[PDB]
């Protein structure tokens, strides 16, 4: 996708990541494990939640169409009325469908960007103390226990 992370160079998702959309997985002597990154995830939750609310707010207004009765000699007025109703419906249906299709693309690309931004944040922090394996992982050049791992996650890793 646009930002190259999701279904990109980080080929698959993690079923083990249950708390949120984005996170970290580490591997050291003490073992392997993963956890969602709260900061990035909560920020994404607020934005999309906000987008949903605004879409609902902007599009829930109704339009009124009354099935008026017309006499034998009002065939033209009848066609004119039908033209109005048909276009009101077609235009709003078009707006509704496109808004959803287009925003769906942005939503998907934003999650992709959030993953990319998180990956680049860690790469920046690690500096030359690690090398990218090209799949979303950073092979550290020094032993790094859980406490060390935590500094990378909470962004206080020493030696940026």
């Amino acid at each position: 996708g646009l930002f190259g992370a999701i279904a990109g160079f980080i080929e698959g998702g993690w079923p083990g990541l249950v708390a949120g959309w984005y996170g970290f997985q580490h591997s050291n002597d003490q073992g392997v494990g993963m956890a969602a990154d709260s900061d990035s995830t909560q920020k994404a939750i607020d934005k999309i939640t906000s987008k949903v609310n605004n879409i609902v707010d902007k599009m829930n207004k109704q339009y009124g169409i009354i099935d008026h009765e017309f006499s034998e000699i009002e065939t033209r007025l009848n066609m004119i009325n039908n033209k109005i109703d048909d276009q009101i419906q077609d235009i709003w249906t078009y707006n509704a469908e496109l808004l959803v299709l287009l925003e769906n693309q942005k939503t998907l690309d934003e999650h992709d960007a959030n993953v990319n931004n998180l990956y680049n944040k860690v790469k920046r922090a690690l500096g030359s103390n690690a090398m990218e394996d090209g799949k979303g992982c950073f092979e550290l050049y020094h032993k790094c226990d859980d406490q060390c791992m935590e500094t990378i996650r909470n962004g206080t890793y020493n030696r940026r």
């Binding site: 599009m59 829930n60 249906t93 509704a96 299709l101 769906n104 999650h111």
Partner: protein, 317 residues
């Protein structure tokens, strides 16, 4: 040792579409289109509908003798005319501007009858009836006919002092023969006039047999109008007039709908009503009907409008 960045994958089967791809798998999505309804006619935030099962709107307005149950007046959110409603104009004839009348009526949220011309004011017979009307007659008008082989010129007046507009009705009889004409009005050449400060209408009969309807060859042309506050209605006739008797005071504004269906009604309340049923929802759209009214979402003719919330669902396996 190493640390990796990743994203969530789930067993969600939810998918969404975009302009450059369809059925994209996603971890979380939200359906924005409401598609359910209760299959019933209910009351809305404006009240209960006026359900007409034997009488048509004009039958009610003119007081067809078979619609007595409605004489006391009603108030409604919307109107429902069942396909069984067939009691309209019992005596053969047509209503001028019927569509406008039915529309004007349905737009109000209530009616209350008001007497315009008391039976006493007439100097001629006023209780004429017909077999076409259950051996009776309209409660909104009086079929004036001669009394004692005499039909003096009738000239009555009424002034709207109710501070509200009054919808009133009247008719012009067209006998099938000259004998019936003289027989009812004493003369073959009559002149009827209905007037106010605004309108000035006059009518003259045209005797002759029309095709049979309700076992009759004669006819009555029906009319209506609205006497505004302060205005004065006046009727003069020397025959053929079907005088205004009771009028209606219309009030408020309803949803202004006339649903012609036999859908079941129930003891229910909904925010949004349609001819197929009602619904309650917080979703922005619905695909139940473009005719929906009340407190409704926006109608959209589609089966689904699934909005992406989570990210692309990519299975590792």
């Amino acid at each position: 040792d190493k640390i990796c960045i990743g994203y969530q994958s789930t067993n969600s089967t939810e998918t969404v579409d975009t302009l450059t791809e369809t059925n994209v798998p996603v971890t979380h999505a939200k359906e924005l289109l409401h598609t359910s309804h209760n299959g019933m006619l209910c009351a809305t935030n404006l009240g209960h509908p006026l359900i007409l099962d034997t009488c048509t709107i004009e039958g009610l307005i003119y007081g067809n003798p078979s619609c007595d149950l409605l004489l006391g007046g009603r108030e409604w959110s919307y109107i429902v005319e069942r396909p069984s409603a067939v009691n309209g104009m019992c005596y053969p004839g047509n209503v001028e501007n019927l569509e406008e009348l039915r529309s004007l009526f349905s737009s109000a949220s209530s009616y209350q009858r008001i007497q315009i011309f008391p039976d006493t004011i007439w100097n001629v017979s006023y209780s004429g009836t017909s077999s076409a009307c259950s051996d009776s007659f309209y409660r909104s008008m009086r079929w004036l006919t001669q009394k004692n082989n005499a039909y003096p010129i009738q000239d009555a007046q009424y002034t709207n002092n109710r501070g509200k507009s009054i919808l009133f009705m009247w008719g012009i009889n067209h006998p099938p023969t000259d004998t019936v004409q003289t027989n009812l009005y004493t003369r073959t050449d009559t002149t009827t006039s209905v007037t106010t400060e605004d309108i000035n209408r006059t009518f003259k009969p045209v005797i002759g047999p029309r095709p049979l309807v309700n076992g009759l060859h004669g006819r009555i042309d029906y009319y209506w109008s609205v006497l505004k506050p302060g205005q004065t209605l006046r009727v003069r006739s020397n025959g053929n007039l079907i005088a205004p008797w009771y009028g209606h005071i219309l009030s408020g504004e309803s949803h202004g709908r006339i649903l012609k269906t036999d859908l079941n009604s129930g003891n229910c309340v909904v925010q949004c009503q349609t001819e197929r049923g009602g619904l309650n929802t917080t979703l922005p759209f619905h695909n139940v009907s473009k005719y929906a009214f009340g407190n409704c979402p926006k109608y959209v003719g589609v089966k689904s409008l699934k909005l992406a919330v989570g990210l692309r669902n990519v299975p590792a396996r």
